Design a protein around this ligand. Structure first.
Ligand SMILES: [Zn+2]
Ligand SMILES: [Zn+2]
Lengths: 7, 228
């Protein structure tokens, strides 16, 4: 699992 | 019975951001259970346990040479990586038998005003999942971005101000830019500031307080210069 910020 | 590993993600924030608080829409990409499966691997009540391997696609063979060795043997007859299932077409299509798929969901993490660096915000059960595992958590950890004017100490703000020898000896105005767009003028009386180690303390001018409210102080430090 990995993430990133929207906008 | 097998907890899934957590996903730790730190979120940066400027001191001014942790000042008014912030909200961030985060995109989580993780392994999820096959939807047209519900994790089953096949049709409701189709998949069958591996007889040749009462669990995983594992079998143990014991060959000899000098000494006797227990050589773990994989592919269990009609299994391996999946000690079960079988039946040509009772399997997904949306998961082809791998029981899991990708999912992109959005989480909105609210960084509340006054949140310290290293602070944790736990999202229960949102971590990756696999058939058998209790998915772990998605843990965000607030990371305090470096600042070009302030240093944080608990709930206060430490500010090193460069003042002229003249200002310090005769007294006078002086101004700085608070984490809150507001500009702050500070007045000091003659001599007040020249002592070694001197620190000026200004009431509630230094950061929001997590449990309660109000704010900490703005501790000022002085660097005195005189040309020529
Ligand atoms: Zn098997
Ligand atoms: Zn499936």
């Amino acid at each position: 699992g990995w993430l990133y910020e929207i906008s | 019975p097998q907890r899934g590993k957590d996903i730790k993600h730190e979120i940066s924030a400027s001191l001014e951001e942790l000042y008014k608080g912030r909200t961030a829409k985060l995109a989580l990409n993780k392994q999820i259970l096959c939807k047209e499966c519900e994790g089953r691997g096949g049709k409701k009540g189709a998949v069958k346990k591996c007889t040749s391997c009462n669990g995983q696609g594992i079998k143990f063979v014991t060959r000899q040479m000098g000494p006797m060795i227990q050589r773990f043997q994989t592919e269990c007859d009609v299994c391996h990586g999946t000690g079960d299932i079988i039946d040509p077409k009772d399997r997904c299509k949306s998961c082809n038998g791998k029981k899991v798929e990708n999912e992109r969901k959005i989480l909105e993490v609210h960084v509340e005003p006054g949140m310290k660096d290293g602070q944790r915000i736990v999202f229960k059960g949102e971590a990756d999942q696999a058939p058998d595992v209790i998915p772990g958590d998605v843990v965000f950890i607030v990371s305090e971005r470096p600042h070009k004017s302030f240093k944080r100490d608990g709930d206060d703000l430490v500010y090193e101000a460069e003042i002229d020898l003249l200002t310090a000896i005769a007294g006078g105005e002086f101004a700085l830019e608070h984490v809150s767009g507001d500009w702050l003028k500070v007045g000091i009386v003659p001599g007040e500031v020249i002592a070694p180690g001197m620190r000026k303390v200004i009431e509630g001018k230094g950061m929001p307080i997590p449990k309660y409210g109000g704010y900490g102080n703005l501790i000022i430090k002085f660097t005195i210069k005189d040309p020529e």
